[PDB]
Amino acid sequence: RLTKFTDLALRSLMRLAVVRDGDEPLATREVAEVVGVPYTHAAKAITRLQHLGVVEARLTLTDLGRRVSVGWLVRELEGEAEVVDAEGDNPAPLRGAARLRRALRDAQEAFYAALDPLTVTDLVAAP
Amino acid sequence: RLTKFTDLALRSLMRLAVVRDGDEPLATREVAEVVGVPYTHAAKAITRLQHLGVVEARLTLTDLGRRVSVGWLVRELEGEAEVVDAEGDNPAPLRGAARLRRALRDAQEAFYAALDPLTVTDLVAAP
């Protein structure tokens, strides 16, 4: 599974990918409603997506916002979760623990490897 | 990342892999201490590992307990977590949501694909 935040940001920019013509006014209120979350979590996602340069804030996607690999975007959004959340793991000494930790980091990289090929435009497509 | 339970069971049978000679008496009390968790969670892991046939309970590993693929074992331990935990996800309608859900299930399968090659004996090894 993923991160609740990583999820949130993905859904958010995925929704901002949707409208491309003069469809409507969309800001943090509109998208906080749309993806179905409080405004407090959606400001966090919108801003961390502005700091990663996908959202230009006057809200729309940037060209960066559309051509970016999702596996990398997930790495960047979920890596901070790997920092904050995994600091309170503190597991005990077990024989072979680090050899597993190696394997788990690898399988995670395969998870990310399957998501590196695709963009947000691939997510919200229409053949 | 993984499941707290999946983790727990892995560490448990990994510890039961350790002693193979007449080293000591090991039961659910000993291993609940060893991997550093309450007895209440460790009985759940020990039993779900007996129902998956890796632990013979008179506690040791079975031959099944040693030659099993970990990617499959994780699939089986974390799949029930995919049932219980993901029932309370209930996400809202988003354009392209199911195409993502496809991708996320795939990347997960790549995560598991990297863990399918290895056993518990590979985890607790010694070249």
Numbering used by the authors:
A (entry chain A), B (entry chain A): 2 to 59, 66 to 134
Article passage:
The most widespread dedicated NO sensor regulator in bacteria is NsrR, a member of the Rrf2 superfamily of homodimeric transcriptional regulators. NsrR proteins from Bacillus subtilis (Bs) and Streptomyces coelicolor (Sc) have been shown to bind a [4Fe–4S] cluster, which functions as the NO sensing module. In ScNsrR, reaction with NO was shown to result in loss of the iron–sulfur (Fe–S) cluster and formation of iron-nitrosyl species. This process led to loss of high affinity DNA-binding and activation of genes that were previously repressed by [4Fe–4S] (holo-)ScNsrR, including those encoding Hmp-type NO detoxifying enzymes.
We also present the structure of a three-Cys-to-Ala (3CA) apo ScNsrR variant at 3.9 Å resolution. In spite of these limitations and because there were five ScNsrR monomers per asymmetric unit, we were able to solve its structure thereby gaining precious information about cluster-dependent DNA-binding modulation. Indeed, a comparison of the structures of wild-type holo and 3CA apo-ScNsrR shows that the [4Fe–4S] cluster conditions the conformation of two relevant regions. One of them is the C93EGDNPC99 sequence that forms a well-defined turn in the holo structure, but is less ordered in the apo structure where it adopts a different conformation; based on the superposition of the holo structure with that of the apo-IscR-DNA complex, the tip of this turn should contact the DNA backbone of the ScNsrR-binding site. Furthermore, Asn97 from the C93EGDNPC99 turn forms a H-bond with the carbonyl oxygen of Gly37, a residue situated in a turn next to the N terminus of the DNA recognition helix (RH). In the apo structure this interaction is no longer possible. In the apo structure the salt bridge between Asp8 and Arg12 appears to be preserved but the absence of the cluster changes the orientation of these residues causing the break of the H-bond between Arg12 and the carbonyl oxygen of Val36. The disruption of the Asn97-Gly37 and Arg12-Val36 H-bonds in apo-ScNsrR, indicated by the different conformation of the main chain in the medium-resolution apo structure, results in the displacement of the RH by over 2 Å, which may be enough to prevent its binding to DNA, as observed. The 3CA-ScNsrR apo structure shows that the conformation of the C93EGDNPC99 loop depends on the presence or absence of the Fe–S cluster. The other major determinant of the α3 RH orientation is Arg12 which, along with Asp8, significantly changes its position after cluster loss.
